[PDB]
Amino acid sequence: TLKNKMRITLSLPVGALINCCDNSGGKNLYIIAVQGFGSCLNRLPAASLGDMVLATVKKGKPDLRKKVLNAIICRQSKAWRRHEGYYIYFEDNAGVIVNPKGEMKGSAITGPVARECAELWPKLSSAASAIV
Template structure:
């Protein structure tokens, strides 16, 4: 289809809180920054589906709390336009804890994962039960 953009709508800013949907021990994280984000001067870095972020664990097991971790965003509330023209949005903002190379720390992912994140991160696609 000509003229329909497949770019991501960036719906998550620094300070946004995300649910963690894997079994790594973290329950909620807060975005600190977005690596490899090239924006405009004084603009707050933002992230979208499939982006890796650096986050702080706010809720979870005592061993995980207050740690700084890498995470990949797999769901976002803000509607995103896909290349075929469909709009996709979810009920919550969710992420999966990963290593700096993209390997998942947990062994199970609960709930659906966006296709944009699964296409970009093969380990998340292999672990996910449902890809939307």
């Protein structure tokens, strides 16, 4: 697997509450950190589709709650420029929880999933109901 992602628009600062989008039993995901983030006094860490977050579970099954978990962003409200020549956007924001090497907790991603993140992660492409 090649881990290339291309530039996708900045979105979702830490503390954001997003949909979990799978049968994991998490209903929402509260993002507490980004993996691989830069260093800077001015900045606050922000997410995008191609990036690995760390989250906690506010709503969902009791085993998942309060524990820290890795997640991948799958849907985002903030528009980005696709190189097909249009600015694409979802209505809502959603990610799916994973382990830190990117293995799914869930098994079927209920919404559609963006192509640039899907073609990034096999285990998401497998599970995804539609590729955007």
